[PDB]
Design a protein around this ligand. Sequence first.
Ligand SMILES: C[C@]12CCC(=O)C[C@@H]1CC[C@@H]1[C@@H]2CC[C@]2(C)[C@@H](O)CC[C@@H]12
Length: 243
Amino acid sequence: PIFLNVLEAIEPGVVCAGHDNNQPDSFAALHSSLNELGERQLVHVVKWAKALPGFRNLHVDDQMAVIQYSWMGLMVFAMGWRSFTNVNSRMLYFAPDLVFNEYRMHKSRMYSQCVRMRHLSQEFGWLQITPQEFLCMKALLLFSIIPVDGLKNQKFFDELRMNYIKELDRIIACPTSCSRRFYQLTKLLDSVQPIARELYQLTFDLLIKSHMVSVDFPEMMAEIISVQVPKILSGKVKPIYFH
Ligand SMILES: C[C@]12CCC(=O)C[C@@H]1CC[C@@H]1[C@@H]2CC[C@]2(C)[C@@H](O)CC[C@@H]12
């Protein structure tokens, strides 16, 4: 099982937000820690992506682009899995030191987005997603958003995406049950993109608002949210849907 061996081997370990849980649950303090968590996870997403089978076949500029468009969906999908396995879905397990209860969902001013993230987390239980299915679906999310004008070497991207779809098929197969499962998992994958889109809109709006009041985001987050996220929000970069 070479493919699943690799995915299991490179899966990132635990990452803490660095949140001081004895300060009060203010909008400012919670988003400060969420943004730091994202900056810390970005490091792990890059190292994970560069170690995926075939990823280095992509042109170097495409490698960075695909990471810089897919990170929100990757991170939300992983957080949903952590929540499913750690608190069983009525809380959101962003990190061991940053677990959202209903009060923090409200004070962060992200309550509706957290509701949707809780729903995604609960789908891992409703569908009885296996660790192998989770790992292959998460890898596919890296190959599920691209510029409408294409990548520098789109042909290699298309072949790589094809092969990750084949791997998902293989895990399901390892025929009427297979077909239903594949439909369920591809419907689950598609449901990540609208959630990520909402969070992309939110974080852009907050970066603008924070800049107005002279509070800076972490370095890599501020660059990606001002250079790459607006390409998503303006329609120059679009998700690839199955259905
Ligand atoms: C990806 C993160 C941080 C990592 C994670 O577990 C998922 C979570 C989803 C909400 C994101 C957050 C990073 C910081 C963001 C983007 C805030 O600016 C607004 C929404 C937050």
